[PDB]
Design a protein around this ligand. Structure first.
Ligand SMILES: [Mg+2]
Ligand SMILES: [Mg+2]
Ligand SMILES: [Mg+2]
Ligand SMILES: [Mg+2]
Length: 122
RNA sequence: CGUCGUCAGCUCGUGCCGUGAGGUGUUGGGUUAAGUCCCGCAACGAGCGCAACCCCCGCCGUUAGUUGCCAGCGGUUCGG
């Protein structure tokens, strides 16, 4: 089931504007583009989900992020459809790193979310 | 109290960069009388200033009538 899907049309990307480090994950250069080695891909997918799974079963929250348009929307989906936090817009600086302070706004959100429905609006 | 000048400015908390002094925020794009507002952005917010909150001339109105007026009829020694 896996292979086919990928082999379908989900591999090989950026061309000639790479990074040599990532040379361990790549099959060849067809007509220009770098054809990533899926064979290896798979192997990695494993260990990855292993981790995900070995975490999704222990009450752990994950944070997804994708600020690029050719991938915004979807990320918005898969997140709500899992209750896992996420970032689709401008990934503020110091979120994780200055959480306590960024949170301050989250609180300001409800601060208004509440004043939204109220007689003080009169 | 006077001056730069009512000029649009000066800073702070945290995060981040930097050996550090210090940066970033407050560089960039449009606009404005304005650090005014917007959109951008390793920044996210905030304070003192700006503005607004205050008084005046303005339009109109309600209450109140010893200023006022043949304004309406009025008597009037002829000046409300
Ligand atoms: Mg700082
Ligand atoms: Mg340091
Ligand atoms: Mg500093
Ligand atoms: Mg200001």
């Amino acid at each position: 089931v896996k292979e086919l899907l990928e082999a379908g049309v989900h591999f090989g990307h950026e061309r000639k504007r790479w990074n040599p480090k990532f040379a361990r994950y790549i099959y060849a250069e067809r007509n220009g583009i770098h054809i990533i080695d899926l064979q290896k891909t798979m192997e990695e997918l494993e260990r990855t989900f292993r981790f995900i799974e070995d975490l999704a079963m222990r009450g752990g929250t994950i944070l997804f992020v994708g600020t690029k348009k050719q991938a915004q929307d979807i990320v918005r989906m898969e997140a709500e459809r899992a209750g896992m936090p996420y970032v689709n817009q401008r990934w503020l600086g110091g979120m994780l790193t200055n959480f306590k302070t960024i949170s301050q706004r989250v609180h300001r959100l409800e601060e208004l979310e509440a004043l939204f429905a109220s007689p003080e609006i009169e």
